Structure 1
Amino acid sequence: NPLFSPYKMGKFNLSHRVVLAPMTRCRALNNIPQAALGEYYEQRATAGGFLITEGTMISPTSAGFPHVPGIFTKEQVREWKKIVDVVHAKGAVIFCQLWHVGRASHEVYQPAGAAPISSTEKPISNRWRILMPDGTHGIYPKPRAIGTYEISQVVEDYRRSALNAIEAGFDGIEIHGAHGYLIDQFLKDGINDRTDEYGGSLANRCKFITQVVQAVVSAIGADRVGVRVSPAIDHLDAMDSNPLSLGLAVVERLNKIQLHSGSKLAYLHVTQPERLMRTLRNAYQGTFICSGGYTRELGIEAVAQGDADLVSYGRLFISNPDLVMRIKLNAPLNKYNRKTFYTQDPVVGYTDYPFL
């Protein structure tokens, strides 16, 4: 089974290629990482296995889901440290995904009920609704389009959060540049209507992600930085007229960051909607994680055919804490319950999915 050949993700030698994809679960009450998170990640950790945490806030203005963890305060650092220690005691490698939702927010999630920030003042259209803290769904508001000074401040928030993640003991961080969130609101020409140096051409639209990645690379080292993008996913009104071109343009800038820094990133992580994946892999000089709809058989095939070095699983990892072992044994998998993806119980639908 090619998923069980070892792989060197730079200075981290992984024992197998099954990766826990980042998944928002909303158990981090009041943005504090809770003991429940430690139990959840511990159940899924394996010796030499790689885990990516749920999206984690970089600033008070970065959230658009309830009870998502932050890593911008020293209190949050202390609590993450307890979780990282538990996962490291099982021999796993763990990266913290840094997440800013941009315009995908609501007054209820913003300090003082302020408008969320974006590249644009265009709101997400009414076809999408936001999950509210009470479990209902609300309307995405009009965001505030930020100037270039504020862009530099957001980059600094990523930089400080990356340093905080290292202080908590994380092996690295992943930049969430996917799924229509803040970075994707700069990348995608269906969203980015700017006429300044951050809008228009591919080079201008890639400026923000480039500056974010460079900032965190300078702060913690390229080999501790992964990058996640989704050029072909149009979630939250995040379409590009030419997804393949956009994906290749991002890869270009990542390859250049690696040359100028003299080191490789930890990986590029691309997720697809339920030949583009292979094309970006072929263009990128480094480790590639594929994601989106992978099964045991499709993951085996992806590694065997050279389409990816690592394969990340999301929904099946929700309901199969021992997903790695089930893939190894070709054991039957447990169903997942969508109703408890984003609820707040520390156990129900979170840690009570059974082992083999």
Structure 2
Amino acid sequence: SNETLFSSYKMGRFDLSHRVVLAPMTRCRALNGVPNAALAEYYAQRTTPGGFLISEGTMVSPGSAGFPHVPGIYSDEQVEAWKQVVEAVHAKGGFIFCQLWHVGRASHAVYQPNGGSPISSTNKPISENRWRVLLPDGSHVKYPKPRALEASEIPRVVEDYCLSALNAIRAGFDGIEIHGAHGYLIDQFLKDGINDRTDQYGGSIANRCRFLKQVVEGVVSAIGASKVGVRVSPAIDHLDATDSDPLSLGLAVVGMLNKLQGVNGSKLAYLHVTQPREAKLMKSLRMAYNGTFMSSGGFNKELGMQAVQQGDADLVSYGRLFIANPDLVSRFKIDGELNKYNRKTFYTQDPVVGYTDYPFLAP
């Protein structure tokens, strides 16, 4: 009860100076899928010594994008271009994980090779009321009808995750995070409100987890458990990703990861859980997971401070506030003022405006 957001922490290999984490955040500045100086600049600004960072969602294969100008890690060109961003982070003594991202059905023909259909667990489109895919021209259109995968096809998509993880390390990354949240590919298998499968990848809760299990297994096999994080969001309806019982789902995922750590012999870097914005559900998964717990969603300083003090979380990741405040860790420390975030420049392509030009705190 004497631990705070500013207490040091040992994350297996990595000795952290504090608990404030940069949440993964799509910003769409990686023009044409390739990272650049602007990304290096933006992440560097946000780096503190012993500070932990999570990169924006990063493509694992052609077709895995549902956003314009998001970066990839499947090609050599991408690997080489990422090096500057990581080196920049390492220079300032921070740690960085590449989030491995497949959007599944949350895509468009535009982002698909040969203009194909996005792949998912189901053939059902995302409903057309609340949700629209954003296109390179800035317009918003309806999500198309996806193609459900053959069972035989899945081991290949898992191999895409392996290569991406192997590239990430080769590019200098300290590790990777599996994006299994927010209604993207993995979540489309996890949630029974999407996964209408007949086979071993659907039905029972154990069956809905089988996809993630394999993805986590293959990646851990490739680069070691200690360099792997997993992000899930059991209670988030984004893109029609509902479950009949989110608490049982979360606990089935938590349970899966525990029972995997015996099979491997080593612990994962962390489990990353996002809240929408009961609170029993979070505390429940925490007690249940044997390892580091990074909690996310709607946090400020006081909430983040009390989460650590009470043992609800080891680490707390910040999204919206970290965009507006490159030196957020310092601002929290001295209880300083916070810059407000501008929504309009979240997903614009400018290297500077709304991206790196958020001012540091004055001396």
Q: TM-score range by the shorter chain?
A: over 0.9
Q: Which residue of 2 aligns with 1:294?
A: 299
Distance 1:150 1:354 in 2: 47
Structure 1 segment 112-123 matched on structure 2, within 5 A:
112-123=114-125
Asked if residue 214 in structure 1 is aligned to residue 233 in structure 2, the reply is: no
Distance 2:203 2:46 in 1: 43
TM-score (norm 1): 0.99
Asked if residue 157 in structure 1 is aligned to residue 190 in structure 2, the reply is: no
Distance 2:70 2:286 in 1: 31
Asked if residue 283 in structure 1 is aligned to residue 288 in structure 2, the reply is: yes
Structure 1 segment 141-220 matched on structure 2, within 5 A:
141-220=144-223
Which of these residues, 35, 52, 55, is aligned with residue 54 of structure 2? 52
Distance 2:107 2:177 in 1: 21
TM-score (norm 2): 0.97
Which of these residues, 244, 261, 269, is aligned with residue 241 of structure 1? 244
Aligned partner letter, 1:163: L
Distance 1:250 1:346 in 2: 38
Q: Which residue of 2 aligns with 1:82?
A: 84
Instruction: Return the offset for 1:257.
Output: 1.0
Q: Which residue of 1 aligns with 2:271?
A: 268
Q: Which residue of 2 aligns with 1:21?
A: 23
Distance 2:241 2:21 in 1: 26
Q: Which runs of 4+ in 1 moved over 4 A?
A: none
Asked if residue 224 in structure 1 is aligned to residue 227 in structure 2, the reply is: yes
Distance 2:117 2:335 in 1: 48
The percent of aligned pairs where both chains have the same amino acid is 76
Distance 1:192 1:47 in 2: 42
Distance 2:166 2:152 in 1: 21
Distance 1:205 1:21 in 2: 26
Distance 2:306 2:358 in 1: 27
Aligned partner letter, 1:267: Y
Asked if residue 254 in structure 1 is aligned to residue 257 in structure 2, the reply is: yes
Instruction: Return the offset for 1:113.
Output: 1.1
Instruction: Return the offset for 1:276.
Output: 1.1
SS of match in other structure, 1:206: helix
SS of match in other structure, 1:182: coil
Instruction: Return the offset for 1:150.
Output: 1.1
Distance 2:152 2:229 in 1: 25
SS of match in other structure, 2:93: coil
Structure 1 segment 63-78 matched on structure 2, within 5 A:
63-78=65-80
Instruction: Return the offset for 1:196.
Output: 0.4
Instruction: Return the offset for 1:303.
Output: 0.2
Distance 1:200 1:342 in 2: 36
Q: Bigger shift: 270-279 or 47-56?
A: 270-279
Distance 1:354 1:276 in 2: 37
How many residue pairs were aligned? 356
Unaligned segments of structure 2, at least 5 residues: none
Unaligned segments of structure 1, at least 5 residues: none
After superposition, what is the alpha-carbon deviation per residue over 1:9-36, rounded to whole angstroms, capped at 9, x for unaligned? 1110000000000000000000000110
After superposition, what is the alpha-carbon deviation per residue over 1:100-151, rounded to whole angstroms, capped at 9, x for unaligned? 0000000111112110000000000002111111111001000000011211
Distance 2:99 2:11 in 1: 17
Q: Please tell me the root mean square deviation across aligned C-alpha atoms, in Å.
A: 0.6
SS of match in other structure, 2:74: coil
